[PDB]
Design an enzyme around this catalytic site. Structure first.
Site, PDB file in Angstrom:
ATOM      1  N   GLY A  20       0.807  -1.214   0.000  1.00 32.03           N
ATOM      2  CA  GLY A  20       0.000   0.000   0.000  1.00 32.03           C
ATOM      3  C   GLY A  20       0.836   1.257   0.000  1.00 32.03           C
ATOM      4  O   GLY A  20       0.492   2.235  -0.672  1.00 32.03           O
ATOM      5  N   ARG A  24       7.272   1.843   1.046  1.00 34.33           N
ATOM      6  CA  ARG A  24       7.641   0.436   1.094  1.00 34.33           C
ATOM      7  C   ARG A  24       8.009  -0.116  -0.272  1.00 34.33           C
ATOM      8  O   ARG A  24       8.828  -1.021  -0.359  1.00 34.33           O
ATOM      9  CB  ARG A  24       6.558  -0.398   1.773  1.00 34.33           C
ATOM     10  CG  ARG A  24       6.370   0.024   3.215  1.00 34.33           C
ATOM     11  CD  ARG A  24       7.642   0.677   3.738  1.00 34.33           C
ATOM     12  NE  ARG A  24       8.470  -0.304   4.402  1.00 34.33           N
ATOM     13  CZ  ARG A  24       9.698  -0.124   4.878  1.00 34.33           C
ATOM     14  NH1 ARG A  24      10.370   1.023   4.752  1.00 34.33           N
ATOM     15  NH2 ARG A  24      10.274  -1.148   5.460  1.00 34.33           N
ATOM     16  N   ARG A  43       1.922  11.523  -8.313  1.00 32.97           N
ATOM     17  CA  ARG A  43       1.214  11.542  -7.022  1.00 32.97           C
ATOM     18  C   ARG A  43       2.043  10.962  -5.884  1.00 32.97           C
ATOM     19  O   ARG A  43       1.506  10.615  -4.846  1.00 32.97           O
ATOM     20  CB  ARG A  43      -0.153  10.836  -7.092  1.00 32.97           C
ATOM     21  CG  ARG A  43      -1.102  11.454  -8.093  1.00 32.97           C
ATOM     22  CD  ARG A  43      -2.371  10.620  -8.253  1.00 32.97           C
ATOM     23  NE  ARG A  43      -3.415  11.417  -8.862  1.00 32.97           N
ATOM     24  CZ  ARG A  43      -4.362  12.086  -8.200  1.00 32.97           C
ATOM     25  NH1 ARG A  43      -4.504  11.999  -6.849  1.00 32.97           N
ATOM     26  NH2 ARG A  43      -5.231  12.769  -8.918  1.00 32.97           N
ATOM     27  N   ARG A  87      -0.273  -8.250  -4.425  1.00 39.36           N
ATOM     28  CA  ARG A  87      -0.337  -7.316  -3.326  1.00 39.36           C
ATOM     29  C   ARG A  87       0.390  -7.940  -2.138  1.00 39.36           C
ATOM     30  O   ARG A  87       0.207  -9.117  -1.847  1.00 39.36           O
ATOM     31  CB  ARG A  87      -1.787  -7.018  -2.954  1.00 39.36           C
ATOM     32  CG  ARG A  87      -1.929  -6.277  -1.639  1.00 39.36           C
ATOM     33  CD  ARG A  87      -3.368  -5.807  -1.359  1.00 39.36           C
ATOM     34  NE  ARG A  87      -3.664  -5.751   0.066  1.00 39.36           N
ATOM     35  CZ  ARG A  87      -2.993  -5.040   0.975  1.00 39.36           C
ATOM     36  NH1 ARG A  87      -2.033  -4.206   0.638  1.00 39.36           N
ATOM     37  NH2 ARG A  87      -3.309  -5.237   2.240  1.00 39.36           N
ATOM     38  N   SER A  90      -0.356  -5.869   4.998  1.00 37.25           N
ATOM     39  CA  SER A  90      -0.649  -6.239   6.358  1.00 37.25           C
ATOM     40  C   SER A  90      -2.129  -6.521   6.525  1.00 37.25           C
ATOM     41  O   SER A  90      -2.954  -5.940   5.810  1.00 37.25           O
ATOM     42  CB  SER A  90      -0.291  -5.075   7.309  1.00 37.25           C
ATOM     43  OG  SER A  90       1.056  -4.678   7.177  1.00 37.25           O
ATOM     44  N   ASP A 204      -1.641  -7.307  13.581  1.00 42.64           N
ATOM     45  CA  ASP A 204      -2.330  -7.002  14.811  1.00 42.64           C
ATOM     46  C   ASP A 204      -3.516  -7.943  14.927  1.00 42.64           C
ATOM     47  O   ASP A 204      -3.889  -8.607  13.951  1.00 42.64           O
ATOM     48  CB  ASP A 204      -2.829  -5.549  14.795  1.00 42.64           C
ATOM     49  CG  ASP A 204      -2.963  -4.946  16.172  1.00 42.64           C
ATOM     50  OD1 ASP A 204      -2.746  -5.658  17.178  1.00 42.64           O
ATOM     51  OD2 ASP A 204      -3.294  -3.733  16.229  1.00 42.64           O
ATOM     52  N   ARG A 217       8.637  -5.718  12.687  1.00 41.20           N
ATOM     53  CA  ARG A 217       7.801  -5.437  11.537  1.00 41.20           C
ATOM     54  C   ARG A 217       8.609  -5.534  10.240  1.00 41.20           C
ATOM     55  O   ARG A 217       8.118  -6.072   9.245  1.00 41.20           O
ATOM     56  CB  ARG A 217       7.138  -4.054  11.624  1.00 41.20           C
ATOM     57  CG  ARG A 217       6.105  -3.961  12.741  1.00 41.20           C
ATOM     58  CD  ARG A 217       5.274  -2.687  12.643  1.00 41.20           C
ATOM     59  NE  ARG A 217       6.031  -1.458  12.878  1.00 41.20           N
ATOM     60  CZ  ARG A 217       6.291  -0.926  14.070  1.00 41.20           C
ATOM     61  NH1 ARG A 217       5.926  -1.543  15.191  1.00 41.20           N
ATOM     62  NH2 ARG A 217       6.967   0.213  14.159  1.00 41.20           N
TER      63      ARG A 217
END
Lengths: 237, 237, 237, 237, 237, 237
Positions: A20, A24, A43, A87, A90, A204, A217
């Site tokens: 996303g 990253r 963008r 994709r 998380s 989570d 992470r």
């Protein structure tokens, strides 16, 4: 160039990994790809192409939510020759037995979006991954000592949902993780005749937040990226 | 900080201008604000705070689509004290009489998203702007020699829609512009007790298939931003 | 004549004030209009035309509910040259801070009717008033010493609703008053290319269920009518 | 015994193959299972238990449609200890490149039934098979020299549907076969915590009428059953 | 009294005939009832109570559409002790063999309103008359030399529907007459534990575009009222 | 022959009684009909034709659920000249005053299926029986001294429903019995221009866990069958 991607045919590989967060994507390019080059910055939605073990690969952010990722995935498929989208995300777990840092593969994706109802005459479209891509990811994970959980994701439109009770329904029906994109990517893949897969790490539990460190992470993210990249190499053979 | 904004309370003004593109937020900060400082860069979603004619004002990208902008506007309202959101965007026209470069103000926003149905027990929630903000924008535009049109926007989930028949329905019912966010921002404003407005410039004509040039989009954009900023000053007095 | 109005072109002014009760239309005609004449009596749905400060004005009941008012407003607009409808009604408040006898101007109207979904391909149509009419009413009220609240109404199909919990949803999302017509009138205005506004006075509370005296009710009703009439004169200039 | 199955715990194996037609269940028992015994005949819905290569297996008809198969699958899971259901059926193809007598494995199942919406709070539940069962079937097929197609089925409520246009929508979105049960079986498996799979052979194309011989139909049916039974043995390892 | 009916308990008979037009209620009282008392005139919605062949009977207008008639019928049942409601209306025909002046009895009523979905958890409530009342009307008609058609009505929210194609759907599924209230009355009757029936006369044919003349309208209306009144007397035995 | 009925035109009477269980069809044929011949055995869905008091009658199972019975009833009507279908079934009561063994006649059938929404443009189709058939059954029951109630059934898709709360809604709205077919049969009858009726006997109470054990029937079921058969003879007069 397309409306959201300032690039031309050939700039992207035929498979694109998409987190996303565009930052990253930059991290993936820096960490995993050889001879990486930036191929989009429109963008701030950074995209890169390079090689992994000789294989041309791209990585580009998709932004948050079904409408954002639907734009990028469509343009990649229709204008840049992309055949596969992975994709790499998380998700939040609703099942206590699904553990923090587990790897989940969305063979299907449930949703509270209307986009697939709009496509499918208000009936139930089962938003699904490509089976061969699923199996390639399971096998790549196994070779890295990881047993990926394969099942349903739930793709939410509201990160801040006013309907907390829905998480109980998700748990009852075995949903493995909650994220915000898979069902939309799978709908685009079906609409435009391409292939997609969503892999997520469990970041989570929805019901009760669990703390993690930045280092934990990062390492779990890296494991997911290795699975995704290695899965491509399996699919090529 | 909130999950998508690494800042502290006080870092944002009580009014935030929001284009979709974080690079346009940077442009606005550099072009229109004095003493601008960057206050967020999480996910590349740049946000800035400075002054306009002595008045503290912030500007930050919201990303594409209802799910993305719903995150940012919620976090701003609930955790950063933001009282007013002004989305500054572009839209596509469907009405023959609405022309490229027209400025449109969404007093309402129609949608094909499910988010407001989820909020409103599957009934019809009229997603509306704050009236005083609408009239402030109309009056600021008039002082700049611009007659802004006020009416309904349509906030789409799919930029690439498979239900092309809907554009003629929008046309029939007088929709002024098609964009991707207003109805979501208006829903958050209602849910969390704040005020919002969407102003758009017409960048393409869906009916006749006309597109604005680069020169054209920039100068109209500048006018829209001046309208938004001056409208805040009217609201203060 | 039309199926529900036994009159001819010219018998109505180009703006029609509409309470629900035809006997209130008679009262308005007798109290506020000079040289009033009855122009409709089909189904007892009394309508009148006269002048207010020299300006031709009509007033006619619309009956109870969206289907009733949709018939009259359509016929008026399509066949009698009517350009503007101003509904003048009462509403019930769900917000404790909205007080008995407050004037509410419905810039939007939520609903549990299906009529706008039928029109709008089962998407969310934001049923909105005409902006200029809203501004005219706000300004007229201000000149009369009244601070009108501008926001959403909720137009119910069931006066006797089996879903009590919906009032909590309405309160949460800031609905100013509950009535039975505005969303339908706004849908007709959009469908048939005209302009409408609903003004209501708060007659009761679903929370602090207090009532009023006959004198208080008459004075408040008359204040509303004065706002509506004066608003027309502002729009004419 | 349960309301639709006159048998006791132990009478069924923990995996049940289910064709629609009870006469096909009898044929399967007679042809493929050793020491087969009838364990149900309520409503003529014949069910049998025997062994295949030493492994206890049951086979029982499920009847036509989601409501019918939902009854039997629930009762088997909750009252007879059944862990895996394999539907073995036929489907109609909407894609010309999907050929007569191809084997289709439904990793997902779309539907026009309301049953999963009722389960899932009117959101989109992706009705999916168990991944391991899918892979076992793919592998068993490969060992028999058959390349199975894996993707979406569509489970129809109306064999005689008044909406002919929907087959075109199914084709656009890549549906491999139309049948009447898979989405319901997958919903039950999710609800009651078991595992399911639907394997079909393409009996015809819905739009073009093609012929087959008796030997071809027998070969293809037998091939499907062999795939199903051999997939169980792989799963056991 | 209620806000909509200024009468006392006892002022209505336990059976109320209801045309849409209050002026037709007045006609019925004057023409068919002995010594009729006017028991309501609020909003001009005239209601009366008198005697027919020794039986106390009331008649009152219901206004146009489901929301209007739902108010009056609920209040009559819950505040005035009413046990039976007989709507007496006109309808439009879609079927080629349903003729002008035919009497149609609505054993069921289809609708495009949302009111019964709201009541019935978004499932399909079959809005039905009381069987004994239907039979009493058929029998009364027969004794008067009239052969009534019994079947479905369609209760529309929009007299001016934007969806003309729906008449084709009505015709396909055998709808006898199109009107605006029956399904709402039947929903109230079920909600509040009373009994209802709608009788209509075909006044227009939607396909041939023919309508009854003024003379035909009066004669057919009188026959309908006789059927209704005589049906009550049969029910009493 | 049709896809699910291997018989020819003439093999069925123009009236067909249909229980869900084909073994009950066999029972009816061998107990109530003279000179009964088996005319269908496809899928074990036994059908028979013989005579009752000289009148040609057929009886055939329809299977469980709307999709199953929809197939058989369509095929009978379109290919075997069948004019009337009488479903003869069992149902569960939700009303305390509806007793075990009561015979219920479904003048209407509510449902949670989507099939009639698919037919009827997502509006509410009132799924109703043929009036004359209802009256014939009422009259036959009276002549036989067997009690019967006439009203709404509810046709469920899920025998095992996850929404227990819906039973309280059914009770509130006066539903006489819960079964799984009537609304589908009534939809087919409307679609294909024939006539249908469902009669059921109360086998169990969803409130007072009692229902009917081994004993109840045979005689209660027999009562329903006698009503059905005698009702046909009345309809022939």
């Amino acid at each position: 160039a397309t409306p959201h991607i300032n690039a031309e045919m050939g700039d992207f590989a035929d498979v694109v990994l998409m987190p996303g967060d565009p930052l990253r994507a930059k991290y993936i390019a820096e960490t995993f790809l050889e001879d990486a080059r930036e191929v989009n910055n429109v963008r701030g939605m950074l995209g890169f192409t390079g090689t992994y073990k000789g294989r041309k690969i791209s990585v580009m952010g998709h932004g948050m939510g079904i409408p954002s990722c639907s734009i990028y995935t469509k343009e990649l498929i229709t204008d840049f020759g992309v055949k596969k989208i992975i994709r790499v995300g998380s998700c939040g777990a609703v099942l206590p037995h699904v553990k923090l840092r587990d790897v989940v593969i969305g063979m299907g994706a449930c949703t509270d979006s209307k986009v697939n109802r709009i496509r499918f005459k208000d009936h139930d479209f089962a938003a699904i991954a490509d089976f061969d891509m699923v199996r390639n990811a399971v096998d790549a994970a196994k070779a890295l000592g990881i047993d990926a959980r394969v099942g349903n994701l739930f793709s939410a439109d509201l990160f801040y949902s006013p309907d907390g009770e829905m998480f109980d329904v998700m748990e009852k029906y075995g949903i493995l993780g909650v994220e915000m994109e898979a069902a939309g990517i799978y709908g685009v893949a079906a609409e435009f005749g391409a292939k997609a897969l969503t892999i997520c790490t469990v970041s989570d539990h929805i019901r009760t937040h669990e703390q993690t460190t930045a280092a934990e992470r990062q390492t779990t993210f890296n494991d997911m990226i290795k699975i995704a990249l290695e899965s491509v190499l399996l699919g090529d053979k």
